[PDB]
Amino acid sequence: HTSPLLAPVRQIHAFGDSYSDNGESQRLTREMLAKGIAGAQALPGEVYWQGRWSNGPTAVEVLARQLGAQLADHAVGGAKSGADNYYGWMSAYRHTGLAGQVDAYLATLDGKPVDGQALHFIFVSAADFFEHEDFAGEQPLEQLAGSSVANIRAAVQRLGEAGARRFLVVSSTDLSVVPAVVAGNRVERAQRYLQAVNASLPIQLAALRKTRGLELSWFDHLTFSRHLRRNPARYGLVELDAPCQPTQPSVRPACANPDQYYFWDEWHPTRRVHQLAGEAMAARYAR
Ligand SMILES: [Br-]
Ligand SMILES: [Br-]
Ligand SMILES: [Br-]
Ligand SMILES: [Br-]
Ligand SMILES: [Br-]
Ligand SMILES: [Br-]
Ligand SMILES: [Br-]
Ligand SMILES: [Br-]
């Protein structure tokens, strides 16, 4: 039996990665390019919509629209759960990890209070796994999962310490069906990591929610994606595996019917899946 809906939201502060970013990695990499930062690249690049790592608005943008909230979206493509980014060359200019987004948020209050009504939305960890796999991380995946969880709990604790009261924390996505993971023959590694994060994180956050009296909602993205991928026709989806916009090994022309595609590129869902996700994320909240 469902429980009462949480109180309405008028302001969201979003922290996370390429699954939330609504223009920060674009703004930041253009600033880094203008300053000649070593190794800087224009992200996300030309085959993406208005600086989103997709062909449309991300889930949290749709969530804000659904809830009737203003959105401050601090998320940065590649952001890890700690201080830094998949893109290691960013660290010289800015710490764009979850921890760094939290630091920058709290630094820019100007000594005004945190908005205790504002929803602090956290959606991060995929970049931890991608960096570990692409650059041959030494740690066991179980340890990496442990670090991701501890990093996210530390971020919720630091935001709450500053006066945040309301949180929505997103689980690991299903990294196991990400085209790049399938192509890298890394499906079992993705399963192990995501199951370890998604088992531990809600237990760790439950404890923090109770100690601090937080309002903290957990969005199970894995259950969400399983339901889409089991019954795609229901949602008008046709292609669950092939990217609409291939980039690897090189850019090829976009598919004709992107709203019938799950994946935009080899890592990121299309605007259609982002819409369904943001609509599903809104389910715990009164409008
Ligand atoms: Br990412
Ligand atoms: Br990290
Ligand atoms: Br890091
Ligand atoms: Br409230
Ligand atoms: Br680690
Ligand atoms: Br790939
Ligand atoms: Br799994
Ligand atoms: Br645990």
Side-chain angles (χ1 to χ4, degrees):
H1 201 296
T2 62
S3 72
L5 298 182
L6 298 176
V9 177
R10 298 308 164 229
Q11 176 75 226
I12 299 166
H13 287 279
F15 309 82
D17 63 19
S18 72
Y19 299 132
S20 294
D21 179 332
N22 68 345
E24 277 298 284
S25 70
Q26 186 172 68
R27 166 185 85 74
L28 286 166
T29 54
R30 284 166 170 171
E31 287 185 23
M32 288 171 202
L33 280 164
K35 278 174 177 174
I37 297 300
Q41 282 197 303
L43 299 179
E46 293 184 287
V47 297
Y48 295 96
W49 179 79
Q50 297 196 20
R52 282 65 160 188
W53 297 71
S54 193
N55 63 316
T58 60
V60 68
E61 297 193 84
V62 173
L63 176 60
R65 221 102 68 205
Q66 289 277 301
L67 285 195
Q70 296 291 297
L71 174 60
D73 185 354
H74 317 286
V76 179
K80 291 187 282 169
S81 60
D84 294 303
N85 196 295
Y86 180 92
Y87 298 104
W89 47 259
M90 283 182 190
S91 302
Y93 185 74
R94 206 177 160 130
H95 304 296
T96 64
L98 172 58
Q101 295 171 34
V102 169
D103 286 341
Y105 169 63
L106 296 180
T108 65
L109 285 178
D110 328 302
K112 300 184 96 172
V114 173
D115 174 13
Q117 284 292 178
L119 183 69
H120 295 75
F121 174 97
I122 296 168
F123 181 8
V124 82
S125 66
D128 295 14
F129 180 81
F130 296 144
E131 167 190 75
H132 180 278
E133 289 307 298
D134 295 345
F135 302 126
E138 64 209 56
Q139 326 88 286
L141 285 165
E142 292 84 11
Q143 187 184 327
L144 182 76
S147 293
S148 300
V149 168
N151 287 346
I152 295 165
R153 190 201 197 286
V156 175
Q157 196 281 329
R158 291 172 174 182
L159 284 170
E161 179 121 328
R165 285 275 162 172
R166 306 184 74 187
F167 294 88
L168 188 175
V169 180
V170 181
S171 69
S172 183
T173 65
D174 193 351
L175 294 183
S176 83
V177 304
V178 159
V181 170
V182 173
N185 191 28
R186 275 164 164 91
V187 170
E188 183 275 339
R189 287 193 174 176
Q191 295 178 323
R192 198 147 35 85
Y193 174 72
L194 78 84
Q195 284 294 337
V197 168
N198 289 358
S200 178
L201 186 53
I203 289 170
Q204 290 289 332
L205 295 172
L208 183 50
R209 164 169 50 55
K210 180 198 187 200
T211 302
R212 258 191 175 274
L214 301 179
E215 181 203 274
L216 188 149
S217 82
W218 168 252
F219 181 72
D220 181 353
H221 205 284
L222 177 57
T223 292
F224 160 74
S225 64
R226 283 180 170 158
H227 185 85
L228 259 55
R229 292 173 76 82
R230 192 164 172 81
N231 322 291
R234 185 167 303 154
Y235 297 101
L237 291 179
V238 178
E239 190 40 63
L240 292 189
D241 297 319
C244 183
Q245 176 59 84
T247 68
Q248 295 294 129
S250 61
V251 170
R252 288 299 167 267
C255 82
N257 49 324
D259 280 350
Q260 298 180 337
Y261 275 67
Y262 195 101
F263 287 105
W264 175 242
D265 67 6
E266 291 88 354
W267 302 270
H268 311 105
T270 63
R271 65 173 190 245
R272 173 65 179 147
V273 170
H274 271 306
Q275 172 77 36
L276 289 175
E279 287 169 12
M281 283 169 185
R284 280 293 289 127
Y285 297 88
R287 295 184 176 174

